[PDB]
Design a binder for these strands. Sequence first.
RNA 1: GUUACAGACUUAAGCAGUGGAGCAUGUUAUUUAAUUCGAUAAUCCACGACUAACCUUACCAUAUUUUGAAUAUUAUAAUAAUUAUAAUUAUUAUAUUACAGGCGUUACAUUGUUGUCUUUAGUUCGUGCUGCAAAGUUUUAGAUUAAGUUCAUAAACGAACAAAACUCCAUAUAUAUAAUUUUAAUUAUAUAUAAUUUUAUAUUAUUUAAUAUAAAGAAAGGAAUUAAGACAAAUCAUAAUGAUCCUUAUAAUAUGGGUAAUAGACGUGCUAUAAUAAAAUGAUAAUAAAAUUAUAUAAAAUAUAUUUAAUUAUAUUUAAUUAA
Lengths: 191, 137, 134, 48, 113, 54, 293, 264
Amino acid sequence: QHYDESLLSRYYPESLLKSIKLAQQTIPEDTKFRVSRNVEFAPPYLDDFTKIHPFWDYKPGMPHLHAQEENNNFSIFRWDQVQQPLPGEGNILPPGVSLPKSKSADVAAGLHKQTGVDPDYITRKLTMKPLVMKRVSNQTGKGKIASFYALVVVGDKNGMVGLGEGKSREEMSKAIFKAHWDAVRNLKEIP
Amino acid sequence: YKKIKTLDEFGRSIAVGKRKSSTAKVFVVRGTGEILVNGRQLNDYFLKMKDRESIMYPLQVIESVGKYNIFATTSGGGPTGQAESIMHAIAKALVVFNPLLKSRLHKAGVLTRDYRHVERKKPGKKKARKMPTWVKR
Amino acid sequence: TRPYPVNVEAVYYAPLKLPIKYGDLVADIQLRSYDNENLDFYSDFILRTGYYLGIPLTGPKPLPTRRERWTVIKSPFVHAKSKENFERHTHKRLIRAWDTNPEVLQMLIAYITKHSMAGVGMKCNFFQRSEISL
Amino acid sequence: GNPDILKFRHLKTLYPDIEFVDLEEQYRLSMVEAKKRRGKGAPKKMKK
Amino acid sequence: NFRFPIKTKLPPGFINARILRDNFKRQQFKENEILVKSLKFIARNMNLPTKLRLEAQLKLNALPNYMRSTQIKNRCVDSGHARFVLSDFRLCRYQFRENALKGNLPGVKKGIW
Amino acid sequence: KIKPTAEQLAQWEALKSVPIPPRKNATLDHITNMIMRHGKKEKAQTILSRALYL
Amino acid sequence: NINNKLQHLNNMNNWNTQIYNYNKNMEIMNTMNDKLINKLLYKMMTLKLNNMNINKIIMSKTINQHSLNKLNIKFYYYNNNNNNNYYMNMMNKLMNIMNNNMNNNLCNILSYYYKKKVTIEPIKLSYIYLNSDIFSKYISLNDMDKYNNGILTNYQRMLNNIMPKLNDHNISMNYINNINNINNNKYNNMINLLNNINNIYNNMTIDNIPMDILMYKYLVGWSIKFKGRLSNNNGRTSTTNLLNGTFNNKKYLWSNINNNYKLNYIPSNHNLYNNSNINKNGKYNIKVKLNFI
Amino acid sequence: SADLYMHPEKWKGLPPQRILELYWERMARLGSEYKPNKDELNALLTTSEYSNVPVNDIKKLYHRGEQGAIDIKGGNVNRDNSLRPFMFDELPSQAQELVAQHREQRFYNRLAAYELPLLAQYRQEYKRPSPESHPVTYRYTSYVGEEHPNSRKVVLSVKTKELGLEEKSLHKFRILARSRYDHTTDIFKMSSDKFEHASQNARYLHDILQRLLAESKDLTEDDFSDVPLDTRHTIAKSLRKKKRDYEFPEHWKRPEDAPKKKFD
RNA sequence: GUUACAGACUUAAGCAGUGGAGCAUGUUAUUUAAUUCGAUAAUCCACGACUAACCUUACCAUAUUUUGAAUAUUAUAAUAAUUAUAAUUAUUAUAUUACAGGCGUUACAUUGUUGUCUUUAGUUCGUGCUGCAAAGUUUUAGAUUAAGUUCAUAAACGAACAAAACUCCAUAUAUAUAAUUUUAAUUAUAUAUAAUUUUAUAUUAUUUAAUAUAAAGAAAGGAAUUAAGACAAAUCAUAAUGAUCCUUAUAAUAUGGGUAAUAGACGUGCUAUAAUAAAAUGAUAAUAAAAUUAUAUAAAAUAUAUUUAAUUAUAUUUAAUUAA
């Protein structure tokens, strides 16, 4: 299908045409692909690599194996920002995720997303004051296991109290967070 | 919603039966039943009668011992394993033969490769699963 | 629609080979790596390099692999009743160069080098012929 | 004994502007200083 | 002067007193190996007279210990260990496993076969 | 879709009958192998055979 | 039907030092220089700006890439507006001591060690959590006190609070579906011709394929353990693990792609390392493992 | 120009884009041989408007630099941000390696589309020397990037008949060649591994073969015809060789049994 | 000295052995100048050690060294030098100090990595719920698996490290490669598919599983992976490091010695005690895989031991090959 120089000059790069003259000169009329099987040498896609694509192709002026330049006439002065930022729009946002007392801030947010209680009330109009912070334990056969029972009373000093318990085997504060939860969850108006 | 095997220019069927480590290549042909294992007589090559009996067995399950000339060529392994690989190949080249009766051929099991091979030396036992002595007191 | 100017599609297609008019060998290319990937890949570029270099090359004849092995104890002290085996397969590929000329074959070797891969080693025994005395 | 390395430190006759830090050396010096402080350093060598 | 009779550079990478001793012997024997070979050929060629030969056998016995390779032991270049020392990686039954498993040794992993 | 010749069919019928033949004899084998020792099977089989010969 | 060369990692990458030498004994020497070289390069990650601060440039283990043609030792680097622009700072100057500085630079002196073409190629990163080894490093160097005793609740939380619990099952399904769609499109185009490459698979180009095919990319689940003398009041050990997300690729569970093992002992997707640092209490080892789908 | 950085005076009359990185070229190519210049600083003052950075701030970066940047910051510290929550767009280091392999493949495809066809051209018609008239083949050893000592080895393999010795001389050569000559192949093969450069080894083999030819083609001292040719080496070699001299019997070859060509 | 299951070499078989002899070993006890040090139920005992003549080596005797193996400081003088003996920098050379070192002790101060329960199927996490609470549920009435495997029921709903699976060897086929002189095409690989087998009938059971039968296929294994925890298990002698102890000696070197000592005791092997077993001999060389060979293998012959010859063991000379 060796085309004519004129049309070849109308669809491909310029000073890379002599190569295409030598391309049509040697290659024959073979139409049998007769591939060597799973060559995996050719790219998964195609459109002629005439144009260098950032990230997909190596940085044009960068020291990398196969630089094919020279250890002198490089062109990478300053190295702060990633040399190749992601292509296309930019985010790999797994389709389905949105670009992402403070302990209390979470305690509330979770319940807001769950129970419906208003976040602001929990973070600014309540006070969690721990009451009993012990360390119970269970005689598992895999070794005496310990834990952190915690009763953290949280209430708005206006007319709403709730006693919440809690428990963890990792950290006492972790159980306190859980306990803030069980209490903001169990708020009850005190006549 | 949502290759066929045939005989050669000389009209013979060749199959590579495989076992232990042998690749018994075997040329089976329609001439009167004589054997040649590895360029010499059958009794000269396989001294143990069992090996010979095993080799015969594919021709014995069919009533065709005496019908088919067999030219076996073995390599690798020992004698019994070689004989078994030869037998197998006969079943693989019989693939080209008795097409319908090949059902019985794969049945008797003459077309079932024997994975039965040599286990590796477990990085701790004397051989493979031969544990060395274990003490106590 | 814009087609695939030979060279372009040639990469997609299998490496084009050539004829051996007199069956006269000149060199060999036993590329060896501990990894099959670059080997077969680099090899294709070599097979390709030659077609354009007009040097009837053969196939990357797959010579056998070398299973170097070493067993050691898996602990820092005593505890030898338990051990581990380690291995380093050395892959090998042969690209014999057939009918050619004494000079051109320098390029294939020279050019194939200036764009080498990572982990692939090349050895090139050259088989020359002359008279029976100089 | 193939001789041809840049023993960590090495770096101060060629690249001058950059004020490098050898971390292991610094740690050792800090340990020595601590030993000196708490009376657990090391008696002097008889200069014989 | 220098701890070793003859001044020697220091082995790059891990340095150990036993490694220094072995390294010293390696450096000395490397140069003396030519002399070692010369004089031993002398002593062993019957085609010679006994005296010339003897003179030589004797000098050898006098040659310093560092002028020997039997004295050089294979020692892990990384951990300075002279036991279970594989020479393919010049390491040891542990630093190997460690480097091989960690991947420090390219093309060296586990024999899952 | 190629077909089985009568020659072939004959046998399929012919053979159909005759049971698959015995590849081994039980009593003998159990006994030949209850004599074998170190994978010394041939020496073992020779024994039974010759004894039985006499 | 085939693992795109882009998807599956190369066994070469599995080996930290990538080099093959028929002169085997010689190659042993080659690798030897590599690791020692790695150490020297490492020590050169320190910084100074007048008894002010030491901006440790975090570095990945030398991914030595030796290949006749030349040497391409490479490592990923990490560190902390209208100023950094008109004046290059340490890090950029480090890039300089590497290759940009004509002859007085590193790569140059480096050539006198491997008799070939030394080209250093560092790679910047924006997430100390992207490289398992680097992750352990930062945690083992910068943090220190922030955990020497307990794991500061928020510090621990911040650690547990990085990626949005990327749903591996959903991510796997979408990726698998994308691969099927691409294959089906090529199959249909091929059938359209089966009844020139232009039509051989039109609509497939540097757009719907080069990145949708990339697999390892989403830190699905990450586990970081502080093991060693990390308790001021407890001489004993204090191994504290921070298991997050899951450690399995569901693509392999139901797709042509099959899990491969780096060095045939650890799955390719599973990357893990521990930076052993000596605490005032005593030396410790912070093991960090990332699933990274 | 490439050396323009060495001339900060020539940086005058340059677009903000230009001087921009040329300032850097100076700072990238004179790690310690960097020389300050007013024209160099003046170039920074011209690039001040764009980038919206005060002429004083850029001049401060020219002098104090990092200290000047901290002064502009006012001592401001970078609130520890390293640990940033998953925000997508990040390129995983493993995925970066995959991209590098893809870019390497692109470069290889580029070579397949350029350095393969364009750089090369029509193959050169070989001379091709006939072996009967031109035997004495030479084998040379070479290792790329490897200093393997085997490279110094040279191998000369030539059939005794190819040399052209006549009966008496032909037999004498074989007697002189001994093990080196393989009678089964009728080829005389020898190797040289004694000198540093292989070139010296190649000349060595040439001289050895010439010597053998001279002695063999002159039975004045001894014809060696009485001497029986030694083949013990080849006998042991043949034992090592494993070939199949047995083929399917010709009488067993039955074409009538083989099916005839079947038309489609 | 508990009702019932299941698993594996756990036991019962079966085969080969140990305990009995001699030797080789590793060890205890003991001796000695020293017999370095470590492991000592299962998980110590041909274990750290893949090789102890010297070296290795750590130990003993005898002599000998003191900024020493570094790093950083203070000064004087020889060596390459960009220019042109006119500035200069490093190499160092002599020294000084904080120290450099320790196989010294603490694995009951740690890292790291292993051992055993362990191919065992368990152990958790978020939220939810029951009990005041420890805790329970999830982690299942009932079946089922090899498996917390899987179904149904169920205050649980999901998830995790494990299980399984992918993985590696291996097997069947198929494609590509090898100009069939690197020849083994009966192969070697790179790839692709394949099975954790399926289809059908008949008994049973209760909507559909098991047992037999056939029929389709080549259909069959091994390895790796040994979770959490516990044993304060083993390692401070692979390395590394805290703490603590010495710097004219617990640090470094040379020579010789020792690790090889032996009343007894143990463990593991080897070789044994002869005929359902041992030795010569078998050149048209009956028949293999895996592995090695630029810190080299070393073929043919050639000489001797020896009279023929062969075999066996050495010596002479190195052919070829740096590896299908």
